């Protein structure tokens, strides 16, 4: 029925985001994406703890999909025979059939093609949701990502002005539940199925062992720190499919923040810390003013420093002594 | 002193809501309600776990009371001699005397009549609050409900347009704390008083055993699923008197959401997931676009799927293939 | 370089706030503050539990600093040789160098002078953040306070009207993690260093033993209840540097609330309960209408009643029977 132009997107791994337009002169298109599910054992911390992950496209989070209002998003979801479990996909951006979940349940060896019309603007979670107790399990095993639906005129501040970002990053936060043995060491398992009983028991107690960005402690640091230059406006999309978070850029602010993540609402301005409700994505933009290292955290600092939820930015440019200066370096008290 | 017309309301059990006007040509009235407290042992899950509940009018949540701005709400609170504990009522909608709590403490065998002027619009929690450690205990035992204070002109979108709902449901969410024995089985108790010591010990650790809607796992499913038709605008009032929640309609959205619950503020639009602060009620309206089953959850999916916090909607009407379609059913990967 | 007038502030202990102007005709100044760090063992509850606290200026929270937009805040941070640990300060109001933390690390025996320009309006957390796992530890040991950056025209309602408070209080909420011995009694320690291992183990489990205002159970009660008169507009600044909170004034409302705490955004109106994201300060103003006792709580009522997070207001004036009246005192049921 649907006679619109087709455009393929090459997805890229988080925290990066596939190339896209903000404001566009294009009309509605059918935008084609492929997600291939991968179950895999991964390392989640610097001590070598392992984890039975379940992923879209091999990453935690799944990649960010970007379209415009009124596009049709046509996803080929692939569950190779090398996986063990059925899977599906639920888009919080979509209308009907449990977000798509009721139309996309696929066994290992199968694929399905779902299309949904992008009638709601904002950033939104997508996640697997097979049914029943498998829903939380697949999500907290890593099977969640996000999609961004931009207005065709790009972003605005609510107050008629365009808000154009120079770059965008996607920070997906994952609560993980790794059981411990009697000795107190984290357990390792041979399969997701073997991990399930212990993992569910822990899940129901509601306290994660790890809270990470991009799948692992320290993922968005060192070589893989986020970057910017003084003067650049950076959009940071943050999602959490199961559990609340409170993002904060240490040494910066949220200049324009959509904490509930939906562009039909004006952004709030000048925030210190914002709030991502579990089951949602939000977004914050900041124009960097100072060079140096920043930490981007959830501001439960226990989670940030001790459970894994810290990213860095390394920012280039000239220090601004008007905004901040060390008037007197550390010295002995007179 | 107060010479206004009197109107009696027949309360109805949640999730339903007693008949009322949205916009009205009536002026202020004294609106009369009766709440009769019932302490009772109830079943809270499909395994037969029992629970020492304390209720207004026999239900968890207590029933939704609906009035208009500037009405006077005159409540006869009754504590029959068949109960064991003192009780009272605190309305977050009311001004003075700890919300009414300091004027309504009644022993078994007593009743009291409190009137308060509805000067604040929105949805609001009411709950028992006897004093001290009994406050949390009575609340988490089930002694909470909500009241809705509508503008006399009905609801609006902030942007001069009326927002008229076709039906309203009240979802009261309850965190419950049922201790376990050494074997790991939930305990049963002969009285609320006998449950108290174990229950308080658990409460202070801040992790519920169950998180339910309408008093029990699965209460708002099967026969008792919520219903709608494609084209109907449904208001969903959600309250949580003690603990945060993050509502989400799976396959839908919050078209207009007052997550802090107060109609003096414009609604937010197009939300995926919203946030009910513990100690509050909020409200979301959605116009259904697709038939079929929806789940309405808190989007901590562990809580939703594993601890009890899932409702269903069954929606009648015609499927819209423009909004969503299964382009290719599950098939073997080529 | 900076040739502006200098003004010294004499800080005062919370919940009080040093004298300041709301609207002002002054231009930018360099506003001088001194904070002297004190590590000390304190009592945190009415049972005599002790706690290894780390403080700015001897108090939990640290004192509220008040300036205006475009002022420069020049803080002398002093770490006397009588302390054991290094410390620093991070202002969420400031731009660059991890909020100042990267420019203020001082060993016992040292002091440092940091200046930052107040370019963001609102209430903001400040806290110590030495590095790594020490960050959460110093914060949850008490090393956090707040700063308020007022517009030069004072506060407004977003809708061109001034919002002038008659008094302001600062409620700093502290999550505390005091381990228990095998017997189940809270442990005491001879030094912060000796407390660290047990305290970190508990911290990572994310459940506080105590949640207090102004450093101790019952701190803002009795002699030290907050006060008001009917007719007075009271601003209540609330901060939580590590963990969410949901403030509520029992028997009142938030007439004007900036829950995210930033004055570039209009306040919300008529709230029952608001939400302070961990890592932030927010503010609520209320004009008292009724005399008597109010409780100001976090509306996790377990936390409020059982873990320490209750303050009182004692309010003088004339009871308003229009707003609320006891129509019939407790009596036997007919
Ligand atoms: O930022 C969204 C917010 O801005 C307002 C204007 O106050 O509308 C702007 O954004 C809309 C969505 O992009 C545009 O359609 C509109 O033309 C533009 O003024 C609000 O209505 C909206 O909530
Ligand atoms: O939806 C509430 C929001 O709308 C505004 C207009 O932007 O006011 C509307 O609602 C008021 C409350 O019902 C009415 O009194 C008013 O006349 C109407 O325009 C905002 O002021 C308010 O925050
Ligand atoms: O309350 C802040 C809110 O109000 C608006 C008007 O709707 O702006 C007012 O506040 C600004 C900050 O103090 C002033 O600069 C402005 O002149 C005044 O109208 C909004 O723009 C703002 O979000
Ligand atoms: O801003 N520091 O946690
Ligand atoms: O929207 N699904 O959890
Ligand atoms: O408002 N009482 O918890
Ligand atoms: Cu899956
Ligand atoms: Cu979901
Ligand atoms: Cu009671
Ligand atoms: Cu209450
Ligand atoms: Cu310190
Ligand atoms: Cu911080």
PDB file of C-alpha atoms and ligand atoms in Angstrom, chain A residues 151 154 156-160 258 263-267, chain B residues 159, ligand 1:
ATOM      1  CA  UNK A 151      10.879  17.283  14.249  1.00  0.00           C
ATOM      2  CA  UNK A 154      14.926  20.337  14.046  1.00  0.00           C
ATOM      3  CA  UNK A 156      13.728  24.355  19.336  1.00  0.00           C
ATOM      4  CA  UNK A 157      13.853  25.971  22.779  1.00  0.00           C
ATOM      5  CA  UNK A 158      10.085  26.591  23.096  1.00  0.00           C
ATOM      6  CA  UNK A 159      10.829  30.346  23.393  1.00  0.00           C
ATOM      7  CA  UNK A 160      10.916  30.147  18.556  1.00  0.00           C
ATOM      8  CA  UNK A 258      14.084  17.208  28.042  1.00  0.00           C
ATOM      9  CA  UNK A 263      10.209  17.238  21.908  1.00  0.00           C
ATOM     10  CA  UNK A 264       6.590  18.356  21.924  1.00  0.00           C
ATOM     11  CA  UNK A 265       7.483  19.827  25.336  1.00  0.00           C
ATOM     12  CA  UNK A 266       9.837  22.755  25.748  1.00  0.00           C
ATOM     13  CA  UNK A 267      13.192  21.956  27.344  1.00  0.00           C
TER      14      UNK A 267
ATOM     15  CA  UNK B 159      -2.482  25.814  24.949  1.00  0.00           C
TER      16      UNK B 159
HETATM   17  O1  LIG D   1       9.674  23.285  22.257  1.00  0.00           O
HETATM   18  C1  LIG D   1       8.329  22.827  22.163  1.00  0.00           C
HETATM   19  C2  LIG D   1       7.340  23.847  22.727  1.00  0.00           C
HETATM   20  O2  LIG D   1       7.486  25.095  21.986  1.00  0.00           O
HETATM   21  C3  LIG D   1       6.234  25.570  21.530  1.00  0.00           C
HETATM   22  C4  LIG D   1       6.242  27.086  21.604  1.00  0.00           C
HETATM   23  O3  LIG D   1       6.263  27.539  22.988  1.00  0.00           O
HETATM   24  O4  LIG D   1       5.982  25.189  20.193  1.00  0.00           O
HETATM   25  C5  LIG D   1       7.220  25.195  19.286  1.00  0.00           C
HETATM   26  O5  LIG D   1       7.462  23.819  19.004  1.00  0.00           O
HETATM   27  C6  LIG D   1       6.452  23.118  18.302  1.00  0.00           C
HETATM   28  C7  LIG D   1       6.967  21.702  18.214  1.00  0.00           C
HETATM   29  O6  LIG D   1       8.214  21.695  17.514  1.00  0.00           O
HETATM   30  C8  LIG D   1       6.208  23.794  16.998  1.00  0.00           C
HETATM   31  O7  LIG D   1       5.179  23.094  16.318  1.00  0.00           O
HETATM   32  C9  LIG D   1       5.769  25.200  17.275  1.00  0.00           C
HETATM   33  O8  LIG D   1       5.491  25.840  16.038  1.00  0.00           O
HETATM   34  C10 LIG D   1       6.820  25.947  18.039  1.00  0.00           C
HETATM   35  O9  LIG D   1       6.385  27.269  18.382  1.00  0.00           O
HETATM   36  C11 LIG D   1       5.203  24.832  22.383  1.00  0.00           C
HETATM   37  O10 LIG D   1       3.926  24.783  21.779  1.00  0.00           O
HETATM   38  C12 LIG D   1       5.855  23.471  22.594  1.00  0.00           C
HETATM   39  O11 LIG D   1       5.359  22.813  23.739  1.00  0.00           O
END
